Structure 1
Amino acid sequence: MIQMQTYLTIADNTGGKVAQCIKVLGGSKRRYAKIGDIITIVVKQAIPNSSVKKGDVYKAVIVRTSKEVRRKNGTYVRFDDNACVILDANLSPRGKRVFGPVARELRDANFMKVVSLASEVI
């Protein structure tokens, strides 16, 4: 349940460490993003001398949320912080490695390469 102004952990090695959601894409009054949705983020804090500067606007995919969402088989998975991964123009991960676990709705949202680069899929 990421909305506008939400803070997120950038979970990849581009350089950013904190991002802020500034728009939820795909819908007119759309208000919440879930796992596997694409949002527009601004970078609020980054590793020094990186390829990503503080104050740039990118698109990112949500990989962990702190609010559980129902699955078909009845299981709910609820992480402990909200985290996203930056994307380039082709809607593919800009980074080369992903930190921590991700949720398996990326599988269905067709982010197979994010899933592969993740460490654990829950």
Structure 2
Amino acid sequence: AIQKMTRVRVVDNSALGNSPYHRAPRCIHVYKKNGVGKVGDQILLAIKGQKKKALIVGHCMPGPRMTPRFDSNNVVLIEDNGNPVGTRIKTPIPTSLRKREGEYSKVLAIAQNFV
């Protein structure tokens, strides 16, 4: 569950993420009917006064069993057309991105590791 207003730990090699800023990046909108995002949903995100679409890669509330659970809300940036801003992703990414319907093939070419 990553709802509105949640602080977000961006995992990218992006300019927006690794730039220091006085506000933590936090979610604004979740692109589901209910406002609750799971692993593999798109959200709007406020980074440096710039709203930006983003993709949820692992959260802290438990999901199904054999899937992993992170100790932060790891999120990968993405552009409007759908290609990601980032170039490398250091923290491990669950393979549960593969089955879901949406843009996931682009992100799974970037991961250093897989959990």
Q: 2:90 and 2:25 mapped to 1: Cα distance? A: 15
Q: Residue 109 of structure 2: which of 99, 103, 116 is its match?
A: 116
SS in 2 for 1:105: helix
* Percent identity (aligned): 32
How far the C-alpha of 1:120 sits from its partner, in A, is 1.5
Q: Is 2:67–2:94's contact at 8 Å kept on the other side of the alignment?
A: no
TM-score scaled by structure 2? 0.84
Q: Which amino acid aligns with 1:11?
A: V
How far the C-alpha of 1:24 sits from its partner, in A, is 0.8
Q: 1:91 and 1:113 mapped to 2: Cα distance? A: 8
Q: Indicate the RMSD between aligned Cα atoms, in angstroms.
A: 1.5
Q: 1:114 and 1:80 mapped to 2: Cα distance? A: 21
Give the aligned partner of residue 22 of structure 1.
Answer: 28
1:106 is aligned to 2:97: yes
Structure 1 unaligned residues grouped into runs of 5+: 44-53
Please give the residue correspondences for 1:1-122 in structure 2 after superposition, counting only pairs within 5 Å. 1-15=1-15, 16-17=17-18, 18-27=24-33, 30-43=34-47, 54-70=48-64, 74-109=65-100, 110-122=103-115
Which structure shows the bigger proportion of residues in strand conformation?
A: 1
Higher alpha-carbon Rg = 1
Moved over 4 A (4+): none
TM-score scaled by structure 1? 0.79
Q: 1:103 and 1:68 mapped to 2: Cα distance? A: 13
How far the C-alpha of 1:104 sits from its partner, in A, is 1.5
SS in 2 for 1:61: strand
